[PDB]
Symmetry: D2
Subunit: 116 residues, 4 copies
Amino acid sequence: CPLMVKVLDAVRGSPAINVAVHVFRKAADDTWEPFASGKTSESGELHGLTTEEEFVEGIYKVEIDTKSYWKALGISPFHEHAEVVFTANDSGPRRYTIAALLSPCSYSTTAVVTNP
Amino acid sequence: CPLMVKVLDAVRGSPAINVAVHVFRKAADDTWEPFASGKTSESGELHGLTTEEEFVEGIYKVEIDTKSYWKALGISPFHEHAEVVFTANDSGPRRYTIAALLSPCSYSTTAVVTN
Amino acid sequence: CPLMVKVLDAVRGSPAINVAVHVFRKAADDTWEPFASGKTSESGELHGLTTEEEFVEGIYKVEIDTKSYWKALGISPFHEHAEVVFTANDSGPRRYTIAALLSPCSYSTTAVVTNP
Amino acid sequence: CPLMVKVLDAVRGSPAINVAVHVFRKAADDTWEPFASGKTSESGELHGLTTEEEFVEGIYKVEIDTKSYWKALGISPFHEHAEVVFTANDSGPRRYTIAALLSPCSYSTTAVVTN
């Protein structure tokens, strides 16, 4: 599908499993509208969030609940979550992979954008 | 100056200069209330954002305007901005440095918390 | 297979294609012995470097030629290459994914280690 | 002090203190010749490695002993060390800061080159 989220754990050197992910889209009136949500699988991947038809142009926010992830492992992390905000499909439909790498006091995120 | 922000540019291998940074504090009703802002210096640093007195425990958001930074350099960016959201704790160490490393399609952020 | 290398481009937000990768293993006498080599595909991935049987315990070096990659794009980068050195299989056979994210003056690397 | 090394810990959100760092210079025969070394300070920084005079153009390797760092903290690390290899150029800016961010199974390094 057009939107994919992949999460890794930099401490354990593994996928980050069962991580809650919520997607929002900015509405005409400037609010964050709930768009889709899910949790990562054993492979640290979250597929099937949306479809080519539904995933129109817009500003989207992908919020990854990293705090709940770390807390369940006994760690009190720095960040409340990891928020990735971007404009999508402004030059036509694209496939987006939002990758996140997590550490207790650090995270990085990368976008992989391909033309289908 | 208990809260500091330091920004690096991974493409040019230098500090990210003149980058807009907005800090917000989560209000009782869950909306984001403007708290402080500024532009990174020639050293990619932003000091004097707040004081020990105003910097009370709570949830804060640091928003770094990476999009405008990349636009000024003529490079297509992916993100609207980089947002760092965290809880300030009186117990933990005291001085917060929010460090960020920027690329057009990627960014990383780290807390460096000391005394 | 047991060894996989994945490379992404943080500037273009894409896989890094045609990147040369050389693998070495530390010998009994302490030298770097050529073990395997290859180049990343269109997906920025390099598979088939070795086999479960061949990939024994040892200290391995994965050298990614990031300089040639950047130079072919018109960029003179900081690093000569990206070298990832690690001990493998000391607690039994594992599957290793060596991921690298490249920028002209920066790179990060992460290991994803799974028990097959 | 034209070459500097600064190391951060992504797990504890602090400087990486007492980390061994070895610098090498590539010799004519392609072997790595010891050049300078030290341990990061309380600020995670290592200054005074070399001088403007000894720091001539050439290929240098900075080796950071991340394995020993993680072993001291009781955390299983993946890498033997972090190696940063680069060419020093007289034309480019002059002061080199090799920054590194460390996690047990991941590290990033960035050049911050200024005047």
